[PDB]
Amino acid sequence: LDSPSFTEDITLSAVMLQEEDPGEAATMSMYPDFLKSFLEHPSSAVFELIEQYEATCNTQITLLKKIVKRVTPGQQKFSKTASILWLLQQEMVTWRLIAALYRDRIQSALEEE
Amino acid sequence: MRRSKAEIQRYVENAQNSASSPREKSMKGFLFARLYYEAKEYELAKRSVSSYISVQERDPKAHRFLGQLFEIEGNVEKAVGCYKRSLELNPTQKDLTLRIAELICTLNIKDGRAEYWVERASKLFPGSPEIYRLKEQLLSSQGEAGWNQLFDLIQAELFARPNDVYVNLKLVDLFLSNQRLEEAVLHCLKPERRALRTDIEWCSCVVRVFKEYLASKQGQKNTNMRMITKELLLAQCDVVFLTLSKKDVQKSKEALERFDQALLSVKQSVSGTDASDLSVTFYEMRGHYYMHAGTLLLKMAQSCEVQWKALIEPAALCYLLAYQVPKPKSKPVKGDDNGQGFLEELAFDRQSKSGHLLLTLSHGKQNFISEIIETFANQCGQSILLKFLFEDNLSMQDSFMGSDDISYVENRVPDLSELSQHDNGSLRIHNGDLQHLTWLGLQWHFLSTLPPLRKWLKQIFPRVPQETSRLESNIPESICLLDLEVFLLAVVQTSYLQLQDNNTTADPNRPRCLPLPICKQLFTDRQRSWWDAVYSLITKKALPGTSAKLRSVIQHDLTTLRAQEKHGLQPAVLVNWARGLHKTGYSLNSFYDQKEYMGRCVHYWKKLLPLLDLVKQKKSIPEPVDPLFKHFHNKDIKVSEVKDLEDEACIAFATLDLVDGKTEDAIIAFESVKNVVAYWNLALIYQRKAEEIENDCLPAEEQEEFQECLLKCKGFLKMICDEYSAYPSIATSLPVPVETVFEMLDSVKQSLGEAMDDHSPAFMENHSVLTTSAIKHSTPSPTKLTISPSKSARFSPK
């Protein structure tokens, strides 16, 4: 009983600030989460699975955005993390595109009768 | 109303007289052309559209419509010209590219334009069956160069569509045309071809190829010959089964005759001591032969060729002979499960079908199997069977049936526990076919026994949860086993009612349910479409791109199954679901399973109560125009039955509160109903309360509570005996035999001892205090987990 939303996020952001590359570690942390999401969803629920991949990307993007905003412009370590942040944003929006287009394509193929 | 030529012409003349310019007259020409086409005046339609095209040359719809007019006249070259012009003006018309290719191939296959249009169509519709047919037609004209390209095309289409019967037949015919008989045989033997055994043309082609191969190799003792003879007997059995279902009686006789001769030819090669795979298959196929012979006799009675009475005993002997064939003894040879498990699945299917048909044909006569053995299990009975099946076409020596020994038949009635095991085996071959499931469910229903649907559904759908926490969801991914169980219970019930309404004029010797091959469709095409959509989605067998359409079919009819808003169900279906789930749930030893079944039973009772109020008010129940389950007015709930159903709903609510461990709320609820079933549940509660107190060293307070529980138990058991003594019809409403009530009453008297028989305190005078507060049977809305650890659940399932 009662209330997670502000202290856990501060601890995780502070732990990743101790890693030599917080962008690579954010990417690595998502490998078990992607497999877990794949195993939890039956083959009939493929679009709920993509929505869960989008959500998993968005959680890490939000964490990395908080890290990048807290740092003074000009440290070479954070240019790599900013590049990985952009690549994870590109991954998230690519999953959203896949969900939109393949949902329409599959639904259309069922309605052509 | 079709407009007359004269009405159209008056309309055209008026519309032409009102037009200010020749251009304005021609602009109306497309509308006039459509009106003349609806009148079948194709010449006037052509003149009208040609006059429109001369003003609007860039309209694709006018050129398309002119092409359709030329096509109806058989002027294919002008039609193709008009369609090309329409396609040039609007390239989005993909359908027109296919139609141009079809028309060119129909006109002249040797036209070099045909290859261009077929290849252009192939890019627009990859893997279309019509494009495969057009490419086949083109390549078949090109000789040897066409042969290699046709082979490559067939391999590509079989890779895209392995289960296409037509493409598979064409590959076999292409091997036969090149004298490559060994490759035709190898292709027929492929394990992926088992899915094609439901098609009569495929099985007949396999039979043809294997007979031709065996004829070509006569004299060579090869291991391959025994394997091909094995698969030939299987393919002959499939041809008989499919001909029994899809063809007339005469074709079924000819199919069975060819199978009889095939068995006779193998009989000399099968010595009774050889545990060879061919010998095992031969005895299995002997059982199938008699099962199919019995089915053919019942088919002849159904076509009115012979009376039912004359063919029941001969057909029952054939099913007896089929039932008694021993199952193949599986040696689990570690390493190649695909071949021997299939004959065991066939044996389970034969034994299930033949055993249920023996019980159906006996009509409950105890000595029926004995009378049949004495009458027909002899050489005279064999000669009568041969005459019924083949007339004068086969002699006793030229027939497998005439040469077979049927004198060693056991007087064995099918056991229900063995049949339940055989039914679970038969489900593997039918892969969850709704006709098979409904047929088995009807057999059990005719025996007045609940079908073991839970076991069947766990075998077909091993990954589907038993229940869902989201009954208000209509999402296809939220389906549970209980949604499938109520679906099957309603299908079986609606099939049973449909068989009764059709049977009110039928011969008393007619079987209540016919064998599967000759049995009419037991369900509606909507029930089929829903079940096949569920099956295809859950098993991941759905065709690519169809999954959105399948989800929409499921989502619509899942609202009906869960009794959501405007479900349109007949009340009698909800009563049958609640009763079926109550009986199944009460028979389960698992607390969690009992709770799920009782929870779902109570859900349907809660949905039924407002409909019973409408029936009490003499209001009509809304019927859907196309219902998932047909309404049967012979089962409409009468106003007299409403009270007994309200009392049954209250019992089911009290049973759920008992299963939830709310024993006190359940006692109060049962005491309120004042029925034998409620008194029985009260007696069981007080007996269990006494057994929980029974520990070998009780304090005096616990000894008084123990005695009070036994006195309450004795009180309710006596009320059941007193009501049974007044009305012996109550034995049908009791959950247990009346003997079990007497045995429990006498055990409770022994535990109370003789010393208390004379002091009855007035068992009902002191609970006349607590007024009317509507007991809200609230299911918990989902409030977040707050763990308070201080009540260990007191209810262990002993």
Added chain:
Amino acid sequence: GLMDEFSEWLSNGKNLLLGHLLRFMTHLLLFFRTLGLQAKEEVSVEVLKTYIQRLIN
């Protein structure tokens, strides 16, 4: 065409592919397989092998 790009990227040097991109490619192929879409099996096997080798490392 997407499978041809994946084949080119794997050929130009397996060690230059970022870990998130190999993850994404793998899960996209599993998605296509779940939908019954025909992908080039040879390239699908090579993406999976390269991702498995990354997980080992």
